[PDB]
From a paper:
Tripartite systems of the Resistance Nodulation cell Division (RND) superfamily are composed of an inner-membrane RND transporter driven by the proton motive force, an outer-membrane factor (OMF), and a periplasmic membrane fusion protein (MFP), forming a tripartite pump with a contiguous exit duct. Among the major RND actors in drug resistance in Pseudomonas aeruginosa, MexB transporter works in conjunction with OprM (OMF component), and MexA (MFP component). Archetypical RND transporters operate as a secondary proton/drug antiporter exploiting the energy associated to proton transport in their transmembrane domains to power the export of substrates through the periplasmic pore domain, 60 Å away, via long-range conformational communication. Crystal structure determination revealed that MexB as well as the E coli homologous AcrB are asymmetric homotrimers for which the three monomer conformations representing consecutive states were designated Loose (or Access), Tight (or Binding), and Open (or Extrusion).
Firstly, the 3.2 Å resolution tripartite complex structure in nanodisc revealed a 1:2:1 stoichiometry of OprM, MexA, and MexB with a OprM trimer, a MexB trimer (MexB-trio) and a MexA hexamer surrounding MexB and interacting with OprM in an open conformation. The α-hairpin domain of MexA contacts the extremity of the periplasmic helices of OprM while the β-barrel domain and the membrane proximal (MP) domain interact with the funnel domain and the pore domain of MexB respectively. The overall structure was similar to that of MexAB-OprM stabilized in amphipol. A comparison of solvent accessibility, binding energy and electrostatic potential calculated from the Poisson-Boltzmann equation has been performed to gain a better understanding of the principles governing the interactions involved in the OprM-MexA and MexA-MexB interfaces. For OprM-MexA, we observed a complementarity of the electrostatic potential energy that was not present in the MexA-MexB interface. Furthermore, by calculating the accessible surface area and the gap volume, these two interfaces had a very different gap index resulting in a high complementarity for OprM-MexA interface and a lower complementarity for MexA-MexB. A simplified estimation of the binding energy at the two interfaces suggested a stronger interaction between OprM and MexA than between MexA and MexB. For OprM-MexA interface, the six helical hairpins of MexA established a strong and stable tip-to tip interaction with the six helix-turn-helices formed by OprM trimer in an open conformation (in agreement with molecular dynamic).
Numbering used by the authors:
A (entry chain A), B (entry chain C), C (entry chain B): 1 to 455
Write the structure that this text describes.
């Protein structure tokens, strides 16, 4: 009979509800369908990203290693399952010694020889008190923990691919907007050079208009470098090259993603993968306590074989040479120097170590979901304010264009208004990128994109 | 006999004094009470911070794992100490074999069965030359390194909780100043809207007063998220949530911490816990060299038991069946093919690796303490030059307020000085937060808070 | 015989050429001399940096651990190589037991005290099918992987030392320009104080002049702190202190690094050390399959000894007590419970894991070299624009100095032009530092400085 104690899951050391305050919105309560059960095909609505994630889900190498670890742990589980059964083997022996006359039976030094081949098992421990079954269950729980870790690696890879793709999508728009600002500065320098060549401006204004262009083209260079260094960072995450037959993507202002229900915090114990990984490692540490307890109890070993024995090698195949052996053995320790007790304390300590690691994983998940809820609460007001700033800059540019077309303002004032519009659009692009990255990280922290479609 | 070499502590490859220069102050020499002897209750002068650290030293799970690891290594040391004793047990054996008619002693095939219940040991290695004692000493030193690791984890947790609390305390005042800047901008927009509706201001001055207001609103919405996102970071480090009945904390302008003596570079060898951990690992490797040395010498084992044996089953514990067995064994390897010398060389290489890691731990501790001393040397004049800036900006604000009260300037010019006051106060708050974070990290680097009060 | 499968190096899962776009130059094709064959002495053309590397390569404690791990794994290889030879040792025995009246040959309880002193081998497994040979090959391949890891650590240390020294060289020039800016601000404050004393200006201008000098005293302190905290990191990387007999260094405007050719990605498989380390790990995992295949085949163990056996204690000297024993045995498993097949599957899975890790090492090296080439293609135009900006600011300042020498402008405007000149001159230093850091990292990713001279 077994000796593994009864497993009881520890309570969550978090608050009962997600945090409130000025940053957070109202709590939605329970979830009809959780964010884990929502597949990543319905979450990401950009069809270019839906193909890039599909490329990265079988061309990546971290996901491939995390997939192969599950097979590596099944191969370790089958080994530990195999030790309950006896190891039937063929064992051929030979012995040739020369005892002296004192120790030999004939009172004379004579060379004695015995040979024989048997079929049978040696030292086959009969798992009566549940030791080898406890090690089997420990290996099975470690396999389940690896199976959860593969899903966690897939969710991390999906959120990383979406983050890098949105980063490239933002930096290309930044490059185009800086390419417009450089042309504005170039036109302003051309008008200042004309005004200096006719004799109305001095060299002091020509040098300032030169410094503006020479400061803009350095920004153009250091944004071209960023576009290339994000293309390389996406190519490394994909595992292969970027596919050529890709569908046309969406702009940053469109609704790229779908909102997900946060749900209750107690759902995080049921859906997030690494919490389940820590729980299964806790169950393995629990199953080790049975193997530590069974060392006190008696162990039963067995040795049994049957075959042919003879004096010389020629008498092996002959009839009448049948032989068998049957050796049972029981063993019970009485006095160890506190050895088995200290091993039992070692198992009981590592169970509490896994309890503490499980609780720390729950607390980390709660913290990085509350951060995403704070970001979702505040980024709506932040982007509404930035979009109103962009609209007011557009109205200022249209009014400056009316004063230019009428004839009151020269062209340098209109060029001064264009880059003031472009700065406001650049800041909007950066804030929208931060809003999308926080939502992608919230989707990873809530259970992630393990399923492809919704269940 | 013992073959462990005489342990010698290696010299620290650092300079004899803390570095000088125009960033550092002047070295004070020796220290009557070094920083490890100063507890964290008399160091942090905030009564709220002390209660938060009192919560964190009980509820944080990362400290709990390190508090269980020392007991795990204690159990491992007890297991390795238990090897110096014979394992006494009850062995109930049995044997029933059928042999052919030539190897049997009668020339006829028969069954030679016996049974026996004995009590005693087997393979008890008599530690004469000190192999198992050297392994016991290695387990003892590996136990002694783990409580130094626990002390280092406690110092790191104390510095992390203090840094997170000061970051929260600074970010709340940053939010409080951002709200006032937005309240300034809203009045400056309402006055421009009134002046536009009256007829004096064009619609090119309304739009830029609108863009200023939206630029303030976006900063408010991104500081609220920061306050929430480091409230969650404090809650994660505290283990449990923030308590409700808290004392009244101190503002950033007051003396929040205590000045601490730097001391000498030769004190880091005595008081910083990770250097003592790296030293005890070196003592463990020096102990393992003795266990590798003992393999060249003859090993002595013993097998001795006493019990009752019989030919058939029913006559086991009946009288006239007492028996013993005594077996000494001596082994000395003559020709291992360079195996034992390779194991000895491997032990020496492990000792040299621990030497190099010990010296690297000393060098990194010196680098951290010298960074903290440089920052302590320069932040005093940095914050002096920063407080003079806020004093001059406040004098500018009061002179502009006198001009407004007299009737020379309008209410649009006074608000442009109030914003400069707010900008200078925000920069002062940021520099003060940097000064306090550097002093908390300097307190950690010198030996940290492991004691609670002064010793 | 040997059961190790044939090793086939996998294909590079990268593109056949480095990427091309707006940020890259032209692909120079194959390199007649590679980047890994260029020594670091010829690459770093600064006579101070060469001496700093010639100190750091001897005094660093990470390179010492990496250069001792190759000796540890050489000893671990020699241990496994020693297991092919039989262990020849002397064995002293002895047995005293009182069998009961049933199991003794006399019919009465007899005491059978025998002894023996012999020399020979026990349990010597004959490696006919290549199990221990494949284990020796696995240990040899892991030794070669550690050999590659040492060179990878040396290249990383060289790149870190060069980056830290160039950062110190940049920050000292930043200190000098900040001192010049502070002197300009102090002269402006003295002129404004004099104009306030005569009565031309008001206190409203004196406070604004005071704020600008406090803002420079607050920056001088933090740049002094940056220079000290960077010197401490350089002394940490060097191991020992900075030597006093340093030769004269060079400025950042002078050409410090030799241009290295990029070559082809197919050279990355040949000369980067952390690709060869992942290759030798794969060869070790390939030898592990030959180690796992040999479990299905018969193992031939041997015991063989010769010496003097006797009954009394005094019989071990004289003749007539000699003895030998020769005991061969073969074992062949027939039925296991899927244990050997699971171990073979585990070996194949551990081969495929190292296949995936080798491909990921190739992809990481490709991404790093591609980022370095994207930096090299853009930093030329960025630095050209920045030094043209510095030249235009110098011409503007010289025209302002002409207007001051003539009599039109006062000293307040001439001093105002110098601050813009210093701002451009210290943006150029940051851009030059970023270019040199990217070039050092591109040299490290291409194969790095393993050799001192050109090979």
């Amino acid at each position: 009979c077994s000796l593994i104690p009864d497993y009881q899951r520890p309570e969550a050391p978090v608050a009962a509800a997600y945090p409130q305050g000025q940053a957070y919105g109202q709590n939605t309560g329970a979830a009809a369908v959780p964010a884990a059960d929502i597949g990543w095909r319905e979450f990401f609505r950009d069809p270019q990203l839906q193909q890039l994630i599909g490329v990265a889900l079988e061309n990546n190498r971290d996901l491939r290693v995390a997939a192969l670890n599950v097979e590596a742990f099944r191969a370790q589980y089958r080994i530990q399952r195999a030790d309950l059964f006896p190891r039937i083997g063929v064992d051929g022996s030979g012995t040739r010694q020369r005892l002296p006359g004192d120790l030999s039976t004939t009172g004379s030094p004579a060379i004695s020889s015995q040979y024989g081949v048997t079929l049978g098992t040696t030292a086959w421990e009969l798992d009566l008190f549940g030791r080898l079954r406890s090690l089997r269950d420990q290996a099975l729980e470690q396999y389940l923990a690896t199976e959860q870790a593969q899903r966690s690696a897939q969710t991390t890879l999906v959120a990383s691919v979406a983050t890098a793709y949105l980063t490239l999508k933002a930096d290309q728009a930044q490059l185009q907007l800086t390419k417009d600002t450089l042309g504005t500065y170039q036109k302003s320098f051309d008008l200042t050079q004309r005004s200096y060549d006719v004799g109305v401006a001095s060299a002091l204004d020509l040098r300032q208009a030169q410094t503006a262009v020479e400061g803009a083209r350095a920004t153009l260079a250091q944004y071209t470098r960023l576009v290339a260094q994000d293309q390389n960072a996406l190519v490394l995450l994909l595992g292969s090259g970027i596919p050529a037959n890709l569908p046309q993507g969406l702009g940053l202002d469109q609704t790229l993603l779908t909102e997900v229900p946060a749900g209750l915090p107690s759902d995080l114990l049921q859906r997030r993968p690494d919490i389940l990984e820590a729980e299964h490692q806790l169950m393995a540490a629990n199953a080790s306590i049975g193997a530590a307890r069974a060392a006190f109890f008696p162990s039963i070993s067995l040795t049994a074989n049957a075959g042919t024995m003879s004096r010389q090698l020629s008498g092996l195949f002959d009839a009448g040479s049948g032989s068998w052996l049957f050796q049972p053995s029981i063993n019970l320790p009485i006095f160890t120097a506190g050895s088995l007790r200290a091993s039992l304390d070692y198992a009981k300590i590592q169970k509490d170590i896994n309890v503490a690691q499980y609780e720390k994983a729950i607390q980390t998940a709660f913290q990085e979901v509350a951060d995403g809820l704070a970001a979702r609460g505040t980024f709506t007001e932040q982007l509404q304010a930035q979009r109103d700033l962009v609209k007011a800059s557009d109205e200022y540019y249209q009014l400056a264009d009316k004063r230019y077309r009428t004839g009151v303002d020269n062209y340098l004032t209109l060029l001064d208004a264009q880059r003031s519009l472009f700065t406001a659009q650049q800041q909007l692009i950066t804030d929208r990128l931060n809003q999308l990255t926080s939502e992608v990280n919230l989707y990873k922290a809530l259970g992630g994109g393990w399923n492809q479609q919704t269940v």
